[PDB]
Amino acid sequence: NLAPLPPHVPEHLVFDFDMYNPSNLSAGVQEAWAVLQESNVPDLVWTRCNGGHWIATRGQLIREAYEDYRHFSSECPFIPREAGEAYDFIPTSMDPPEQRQFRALANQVVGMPVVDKLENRIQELACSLIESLRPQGQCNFTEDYAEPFPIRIFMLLAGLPEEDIPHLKYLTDQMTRPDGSMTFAEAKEALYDYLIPIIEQRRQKPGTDAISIVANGQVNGRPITSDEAKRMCGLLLVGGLDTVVNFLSFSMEFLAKSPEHRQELIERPERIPAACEELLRRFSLVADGRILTSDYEFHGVQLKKGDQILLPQMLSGLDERENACPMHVDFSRQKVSHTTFGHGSHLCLGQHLARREIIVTLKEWLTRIPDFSIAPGAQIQHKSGIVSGVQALPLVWDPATTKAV
Numbered sequence: 306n307l308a309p310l311p312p313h314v315p316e317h318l319v320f321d322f323d324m325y326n327p328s329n330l331s332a333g334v335q336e337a338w339a340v341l342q343e344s345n346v347p348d349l350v351w352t353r354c355n356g357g358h359w360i361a362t363r364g365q366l367i368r369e370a371y372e373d374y375r376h377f378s379s380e381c382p383f384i385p386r387e388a389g390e391a392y393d394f395i396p397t398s399m400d401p402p403e404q405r406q407f408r409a410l411a412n413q414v415v416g417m418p419v420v421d422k423l424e425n426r427i428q429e430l431a432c433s434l435i436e437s438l439r440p441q442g443q444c445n446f447t448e449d450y451a452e453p454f455p456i457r458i459f460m461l462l463a464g465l466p467e468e469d470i471p472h473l474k475y476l477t478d479q480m481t482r483p484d485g486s487m488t489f490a491e492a493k494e495a496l497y498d499y500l501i502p503i504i505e506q507r508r509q510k511p512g513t514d515a516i517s518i519v520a521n522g523q524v525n526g527r528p529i530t531s532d533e534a535k536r537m538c539g540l541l542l543v544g545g546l547d548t549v550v551n552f553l554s555f556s557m558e559f560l561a562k563s564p565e566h567r568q569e570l571i572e573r574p575e576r577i578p579a580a581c582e583e584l585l586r587r588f589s590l591v592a593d594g595r596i597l598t599s600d601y602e603f604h605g606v607q608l609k610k611g612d613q614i615l616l617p618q619m620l621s622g623l624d625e626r627e628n629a630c631p632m633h634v635d636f637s638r639q640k641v642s643h644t645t646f647g648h649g650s651h652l653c654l655g656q657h658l659a660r661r662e663i664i665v666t667l668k669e670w671l672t673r674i675p676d677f678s679i680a681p682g683a684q685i686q687h688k689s690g691i692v693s694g695v696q697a698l699p700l701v702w703d704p705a706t707t708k709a710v
C-alpha cells in the first residue's frame with residue numbers, strides 16, 4: 306500500500322521504505338534499515354508507505370533536524386499520522402520552552418540520583434535471575450531475562466503490581482510494533498484507562514513511588530493536572546517496558562555469536578563501559594520523527610508545512626561518515642558516535658537507568674555464564690517499528706562451564 310505522491314515531491318527522491326516491514330529484515334533489523342545508506346539513496350528521501358513521509362538517512366541531517374525544533378516540531382512525532390496525532394505523551398509531544406518544565410519533573414523520577422539509589426536492587430535482581438538460569442543450560446533470553454529484568458525494576462520504581470505486566474506490555478508493544486489487532490488510539494486509551502485510577506489514588510494518598518511524585522509535582526509554579534500526569538506516566542511506562550528490553554536481546558544475540566567479544570570483556574573488565582557504548586551504537590533501535598511547522602527548504606529539498614519526516618535515531622551511528630566500518634563491533638573505537646538516546650532538547654532522561662542495567666547484565670552474565678551460544682537450528686527474528694525488537698532468543702550452554710557466585 307503505496308500512497309500517491311504529493312506534488313512537491315521530486316520522483317528522484319522517492320524510496321519506498323516500510324519502517325514497519327523493511328525488506329532485508331531476515332539479515333537483521335539494523336541491516337534492514339542501513340539499506341537507506343547505500344550509495345543509490347539520496348540523503349533525504351520520501352516513502353509512499355505508511356502514508357508518505359520523508360526520511361533523513363544521515364547522521365548530519367538527523368542531528369540538524371533534532372536541533373531545529375522551530376522547524377521540526379514534536380507535536381506529531383510518530384508515523385503514521387493517526388499515530389503521531391493520537392499520541393500526546395509529555396514531554397515528548399512538546400517543544401521548548403513548554404517542554405523544559407515537564408522535563409525537569411521527569412528527571413526527578415528517572416535521573417541519576419534515582420539510579421544511584423536503585424543500584425543494589427538492580428545488581429540484586431540481575432544476579433538472582435542469572436543464578437536461577439545458570440544450571441539449566443538453556444533459556445529464552447527474551448522472556449527469561451530481557452523482559453523481567455528491566456520490567457521488574459520499573460514496576461518497583463513506579464510502585465505497580467507485577468501482575469500487571471502481561472497486560473501493560475501488550476499495550477506498550479501495540480504502540481511501537483503495531484500488530485494490527487488494535488490502533489494507536491485504542492491502545493493509547495487502554496493504557497490510559499489503567500493509569501487514571503492509579504493517579505487519582507496517588508494525588509489523594511501519595512507514596513514515594515514514581516507515579517506519586519509525578520502526580521503531585523510542580524510545573525511552572527502551579528500543580529500538574531491529572532491529565533498532564535497521565536500523559537507523562539504514559540511515557541514512563543513505554544520507556545520502562547519497551548526499551549532496555551529490546552536492547553538487551555540484540556546485545557545478547559551479538560554476544561552469543563562472538564566468543565572473542567565475550568573474552569575481551571572477561572579479561573579486560575575496564576572495557577565494559579566502552580563496550581556498552583559501542584553496542585548502543587551498533588544495536589541502536591529507536592526511530593521517530595517530527596512534523597514541519599511550515600514550508601522550509603532543508604538541504605536543497607522543499608518540505609511543506611504538515612509533512613512528517615522520520616529521523617531514525619538508529620541510523621546516525623551506522624552511517625559511515627560518522628563511524629568507519631559501522632556494522633563492525635570494535636570495543637576499542639577512538640570515537641563512538643551515535644544518537645541512540647536522541648539528540649537535541651528531547652535527549653533521553655532514562656539513559657542512566659538504561660546504561661546501569663546494561664553494564665550490570667554484561668558484567669553479571671559473563672561472570673557466571675562465560676560460554677554460551679544460540680540454540681542449534683534457532684532462527685532469530687527481528688521486528689521493526691518505532692522501537693525494534695527480537696522475537697525470541699533461544700540460548701544453550703553447558704552448565705559444567707558456568708560459575709556459581
Ligand code: HEM
Pocket residue numbers: 382395396397404408411415540541542544545548549552590591593594618644645646647648650651652653654655656658659
Ligand atoms: C536502551 C534504552 C533506551 C533508548 C534507546 C531510549 C531512547 C530514547 C529516545 C531516542 C528519546 C527521544 C525521542 C524523541 O526525541 O522523540 C527518548 C526520550 C525519553 N526517554 Fe528514553 N530510551 C531508552 C530508555 C528509557 C528508559 C528506561 C526511560 C525511563 C523509564 C526512558 C525515558 C525517556 C523519557 C522520559 C524521554 C523524554 C525526554 C524529553 O522529551 O525531554 N527512556 N528515549
Ligand SMILES: c1ccc(-n2ccnc2)cc1
Pocket residue numbers: 481540543544545548591593653655691692
Ligand atoms: C517512541 C516510543 C518510546 C520512546 N521512549 C520512551 C522512553 N524512551 C524512549 C520514544 C519514542
